[PDB]
């Protein structure tokens, strides 16, 4: 009845969040991967600026 | 009734996505600003490679959520 209706209201807010952090957490990843692709053209060059990077794409937290 | 007990149930498993969803987000955001500042300490380095990397990132700024 009315705590029907309220449960409903929460229901759709926490889709519309859901949504949202999803949306924002596959572009975050995209952006790593394109990063992650930049790394692994270059690893020939030793360079150790790009190594501090890769730890970083490769730590688990 | 069953309706307001269904709605609890959907309730829960949302909470909890939503829970792991920002753990996820949080998690690969604190990597790219993680990169920025290695990039953001090599700036006069003139190194092609940091360069592209900033670009990539310049979308993920703070500044664009805030």
């Given at each position: 009845?009315?705590?029907?209706?309220?449960?409903?209201?929460?229901v759709?807010?926490?889709?519309?969040?859901?949504?949202?952090?999803?949306?924002?957490?596959?572009?975050?990843?995209?952006?790593?991967?394109?990063?992650?692709?930049?790394?692994?053209?270059?690893?020939?060059?030793?360079?150790?600026?790009?190594?501090?990077?890769?730890?970083?794409?490769y730590a688990?937290?």
């Open positions: 009845d009315d705590e029907a209706a309220e449960l409903m209201q929460q759709n807010v926490l889709k519309l969040t859901v949504e949202d952090l999803e949306k924002e957490r596959d572009f975050y990843f995209g952006k790593l991967r394109n990063i992650e692709l930049i790394c692994q053209e270059n690893e020939g060059e030793n360079d150790p600026v790009l190594q501090r990077i890769m730890d970083i794409l688990t937290d």
